[PDB]
């Protein structure tokens, strides 16, 4: 029962860093968006074409993150020191190169791709500079996580952890200096993020060379082979990052059809469901590592145990959650909007869905836990049914027959189910191969 104690204090200095560094990083971004809403119609409506293009580039980067934390972990595990810090220069030479060439065509196609989003002639001459900063501070980020992917990939959250606070804390002070004291507006928000991530580059970058996770010795490296193997579950992986917004495409028309008001208390909802599984989420970064490197070394007891004491905490702490909340849910309501009906809605949100958080979050961890396992098509059926099969159908049901107070409770089945569902098919996949004999 010591080892049992022992891999819940590790999963914890694991995971609690993750958790400070998502957390700084909200804090910046919640307050980032009021900078830029002093900014005006047309430089906010400009932002706002931008947030779909930030979907895809975010899906890139957190896809390869994904199986950059799989491979080299379980490389680690086998005891593959060589290959395993070679494959950690690979990361970053395949994604600096890859999200480049992603940038620029992305610029250079930004008339068409606007276009189609439906968007006015008029935030052209805003994006015609504006994407030129921002393109440079989406690769900029992606490069920090690519190098964050590679510490957790060596078992180490800590610095990236602390490094997120820094950048956030750093870009929130220079957030208004360059939109406001030197009126670059909206391209000052982009170069604030350009020197943040870029003081997080130089920080990071000679930590991880130093303790030799990155080489650039390639002689002895089979780069086909690497790719392969990287890409397995890279391919898979981006796939699953694509479903949220078509999840986001259904629920809109649902929504919009119950009014304004229910829109915007569907839009505090699920701001607050993100908040509320914020828990789940650093878990899912900090997690993979340690079964990946587990499996590598054959430790597939602690395999086994590490993930039940994973799903232990999320059940019984997004009840905990769940609880407060339910009995807090109108004075909350009434904190987040000053609009009753808006408010009566959310209120509404607050006693039904937030019970189902905790199935939510068992999904997400089963999704993140097979990929660990290197069972990328495990995880995308686990996300695609939870999307397709369970969660919008019994949306549109609820709608259909109970207006939005339906639509509420479908979200509550279709997050259980769909959680229950996630834990079976981890026992499958279990069951599918023997773990001791790869």
């Given at each position: 029962q010591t080892s049992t104690s022992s891999l819940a204090k590790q999963l914890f200095q694991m995971t609690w860093p993750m958790l400070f560094g998502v957390l700084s990083l909200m804090s910046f971004q919640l307050v980032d968006s009021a900078f830029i809403g002093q900014l005006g119609v047309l430089p906010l409506a400009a932002q706002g074409f931008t947030m779909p293009i930030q979907m895809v580039i975010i899906g890139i980067q957190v896809g390869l993150g994904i199986a950059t934390t799989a491979v080299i972990s379980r490389a680690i595990g086998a005891g593959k020191t060589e290959y395993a810090k070679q494959l950690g220069g690979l990361v970053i030479v395949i994604g600096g190169i890859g999200v480049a060439l992603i940038a620029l065509v992305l610029y250079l196609l930004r008339q068409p791709l606007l276009g189609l989003l439906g968007?006015?002639?008029?935030v052209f001459a805003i994006i015609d500079h504006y994407w030129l900063w921002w393109l440079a501070s989406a690769w900029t980020g992606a490069m920090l996580y690519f190098y964050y992917s590679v510490c957790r990939a060596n078992g180490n959250t800590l610095l990236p952890g602390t490094l997120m606070m820094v950048t956030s804390v750093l870009n929130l002070i220079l957030d208004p200096i360059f939109i406001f004291?030197?009126?670059?507006?909206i391209d000052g928000a982009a170069i604030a993020t350009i020197i943040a991530f870029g003081v997080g580059i130089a920080i990071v970058a000679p930590k991880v060379a130093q303790r030799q996770w990155?080489?650039?010795?390639?002689?002895?490296?089979?780069i086909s082979q690497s790719l392969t193997a990287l890409g397995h579950i890279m391919g898979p992986a981006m796939l699953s990052q694509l479903l949220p917004p078509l999840s986001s495409m259904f629920a809109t028309k649902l929504l919009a059809s119950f009014g304004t008001a229910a829109v915007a208390a569907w839009a505090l909802g699920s701001r607050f469901e993100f908040f509320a599984l914020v828990a789940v989420l650093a878990m899912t970064m900090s997690l993979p590592p340690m079964i990946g490197r587990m499996l590598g070394a054959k430790e597939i007891t602690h395999i086994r145990q590490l993930v039940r004491i994973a799903c232990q905490f999320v059940l019984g702490f997004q009840l905990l959650i769940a609880l407060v909340t339910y009995v807090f849910a109108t004075p909350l309501a009434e904190l987040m909007t000053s609009e009753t009906e808006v408010s009566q809605i959310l209120n509404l949100h607050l006693v039904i869905v937030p019970i189902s958080l905790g199935a939510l979050g068992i999904c997400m961890l089963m999704v993140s836990v097979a990929n660990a396992l290197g069972k990328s098509y495990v995880a995308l059926t686990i996300s695609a049914l939870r999307l397709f099969a369970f969660y919008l159908p019994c949306l549109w049901l609820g709608a259909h027959f109970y207006g939005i107070e339906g639509l509420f409770i479908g979200a509550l089945v279709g997050n259980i189910i769909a959680g229950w569902a996630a834990w079976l098919a981890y026992q499958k996949a279990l069951r599918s191969e023997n773990l001791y004999f790869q």
């Open positions: 968007a006015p002639e008029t004291t030197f009126d670059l507006g990155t080489s650039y010795q390639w002689q002895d490296l089979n």
